[PDB]
Design a protein around this nucleic acid. Sequence first.
DNA 1: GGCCCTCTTTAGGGCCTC
Length: 208
Amino acid sequence: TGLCDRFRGFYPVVIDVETAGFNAKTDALLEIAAITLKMDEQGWLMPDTTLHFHVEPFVGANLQPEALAFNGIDPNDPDRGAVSEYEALHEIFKVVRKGIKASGCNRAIMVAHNANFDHSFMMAAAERASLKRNPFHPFATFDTAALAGLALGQTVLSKACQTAGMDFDSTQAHSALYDTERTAVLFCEIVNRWKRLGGWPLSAAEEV
DNA sequence: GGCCCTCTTTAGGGCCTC
Ligand SMILES: [Mg+2]
Ligand SMILES: [Mg+2]
């Protein structure tokens, strides 16, 4: 009934990033939010700790106008409250390592919607920032797009949430914190629903 | 931004991770 037993020792952390393009190697990371998860005594999954950072474009970063048009971020607004990629990820890594330790897990796995996108940008930023002992799995992810495909027959984040009976506000979409929060609730609902229907634990699946 | 589909090509709009 513990978090460490649910995903073979992986500590699931929900991540959403905002960027200045689709190229993780060359395009700026502009924003990141992280949500750790916890399991109660009954084995139900729910959000734990929330982190959120506005990120300064790394020196020499490429910025695509169409991306900025999409996410509405102005990297030149001085009142952004932006910090370096190093600062943002160092704090996220610290909180995640603390969570891994306390929960008895072995390492973290990124939960994200179309997770390869966020995973690729996180790894790139961590490499640029020279961060060491990255607690995230270097290639495995929990993609909520695929999970929603299974659980709900939908792959688009907004539609998956709506289909799951969740609230989803289009006026708040495409903002990092809101997207991460909805993705975390969606992941938790998918996992909890599997348990409600008797698919987990495996002993329950074997009944009748 | 650009590939893809089609009620296509002398084009528009869906895609839905930025
Ligand atoms: Mg996203
Ligand atoms: Mg987003």
